[PDB]
Design a binder for this molecule. Sequence first.
Ligand code: LP5
Ligand code: LP5
Ligand code: MG
Ligand code: MG
Lengths: 277, 277
Amino acid sequence: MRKLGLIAGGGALPVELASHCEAAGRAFAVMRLRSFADPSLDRYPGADVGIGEFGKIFKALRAEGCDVVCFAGNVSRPDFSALMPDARGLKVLPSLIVAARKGDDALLRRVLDEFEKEGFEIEGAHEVMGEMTLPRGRLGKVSPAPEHMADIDKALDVAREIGRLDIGQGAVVCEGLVLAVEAQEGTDAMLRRVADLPEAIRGRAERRLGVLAKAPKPIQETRVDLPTIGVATIHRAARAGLAGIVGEAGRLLVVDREAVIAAADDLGLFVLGVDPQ
Amino acid sequence: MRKLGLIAGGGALPVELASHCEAAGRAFAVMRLRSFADPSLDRYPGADVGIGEFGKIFKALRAEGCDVVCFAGNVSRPDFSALMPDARGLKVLPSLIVAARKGDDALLRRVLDEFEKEGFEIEGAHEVMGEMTLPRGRLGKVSPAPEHMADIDKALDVAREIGRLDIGQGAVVCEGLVLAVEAQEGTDAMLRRVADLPEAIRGRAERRLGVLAKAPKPIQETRVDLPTIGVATIHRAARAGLAGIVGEAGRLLVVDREAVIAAADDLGLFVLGVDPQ
Ligand SMILES: CCCCCCCCCCC[C@@H](O)CC(=O)N[C@H]1[C@@H](OP(=O)(O)O)O[C@H](CO)[C@@H](O)[C@@H]1OC(=O)C[C@H](O)CCCCCCCCCCC
Ligand SMILES: CCCCCCCCCCC[C@@H](O)CC(=O)N[C@H]1[C@@H](OP(=O)(O)O)O[C@H](CO)[C@@H](O)[C@@H]1OC(=O)C[C@H](O)CCCCCCCCCCC
Ligand SMILES: [Mg+2]
Ligand SMILES: [Mg+2]
């Protein structure tokens, strides 16, 4: 996982991105564009730079060891007279004004040419999310078996009806039997209480049965964060003799992706991203 | 609690009654009327008597130390020639034939006069249930406070929506916060996991908050038993700093009523029966 240089313009997108990055445990820093970046970003490591202190931005970008950057947020073309660039900066400035004369698009494009020529890999907001969340389909080497399809389907739309009822975000289904429903206790606790059920209605570590599904509750006016998967999640779900874990393909954060994949792989669990709706 | 002499005619009523009696831990015996009583009653302590081996029935009734009887099930008037009474029996027989000449009602009534004159307290099926289940309103000395009304209302219709979803039969609500939802793990386990939540979102043993509601799932073609309340239920709900417990007034079995009342009373919990629907 490349460390991210989040270049933050105005609005709520970079803010969401930062939080999700920190939840996923992904490494980053924030380049907060003066007068654009929302102040609730000052809490993250990084730097407050004006446009176009390009010299400064490359400086801090390398200073944080970012090799990939994402540009997220509202930015409008500036005043080119009132601009107070550093000397890098002033070097780039005319190239900008030419492109600017051709339109915002050519201008934005020109800015990116510079970061590429400098040179950092450029990523879009969607791809940043994509790489931290579930994929579509298996995450590790283990796939589900036809036996598990049954539970996978009902694990989810149960876990969704829980969410619709503003309760918890998780549910464990084994052979059609809802064994466990999350609400307020955390997923670890639930997976423990499941390991504790009679092996009769349960899966076995030898022969595994049953599926953990964890799905996000529907959006709100209040900001909404995504459900998460830990390495300890893989641990306890294995100890419950569960066959695998599942969630909506974009809508679930994986904390330490590498580590999670290795637990699931070593223990025989599948982890599955599922097409939303 | 008077020990019950369940006098079992045909059909599924006495069967249900026996099971509920045994779930409530209430003392009983079954007088299984030959050719009437369903054979799944042979498992319970008691006796197989024909009508009208009255001598036998009084004998075994006392032999089980029953001082109250309930007549439950289908019975039709018999053949009075083909009847093989014992000598008690034959003594009573004519009194019966007189009443029988006035109608089934007078006949049934006459039978009851005999058990009363013998003499056992006669109870109806409904009253038998009533005395084992919740009442309507408080069960013990403790009442709910106005503060608790909030949770009481939502504890229940949550616990009902769980039941509608064929999951578990219980739910714990505190200050509007669903803390816990039962499914497959038993109520004891849930009440433990609740005692384990942060005291921040929880009630305190000093100042109590929150309510356990446990409600029956909707009827089925398959026979349906009632949710139950234990003394350990009172224990753990107290240890979770809950203010009280609640259920539908007829629709919840109390196991060791005396003992439960004394736990709730000594610990400061209310236990509340609520009008169904
Ligand atoms: C110190 C050095 C700092 C260097 C400054 C770098 C700032 C670059 C500008 C970043 C804007 C970028 O975050 C916006 C963006 O990408 N959005 C694309 C997206 O559409 P949205 O609906 O707006 O989400 O998806 C679309 C595709 O589906 C796509 O087309 C949208 O692109 C735009 O939003 C267009 C821009 O909003 C137009 C503004 C151009 C940049 C103006 C300022 C240029 C920098 C000044 C340099 C001196
Ligand atoms: C060894 C000694 C054994 C002695 C034998 C004792 C057997 C007594 C008969 C028991 C019948 C009783 O269980 C039924 C009953 O109570 N039901 C009442 C109830 O209505 P349901 O809709 O039927 O539930 O609620 C109604 C009120 O809302 C009420 O009216 C219904 O009463 C009846 O069901 C009427 C009976 O079904 C009619 C039958 C009379 C008894 C016939 C056999 C008499 C015993 C033979 C003695 C030799
Ligand atoms: Mg982009
Ligand atoms: Mg009666």
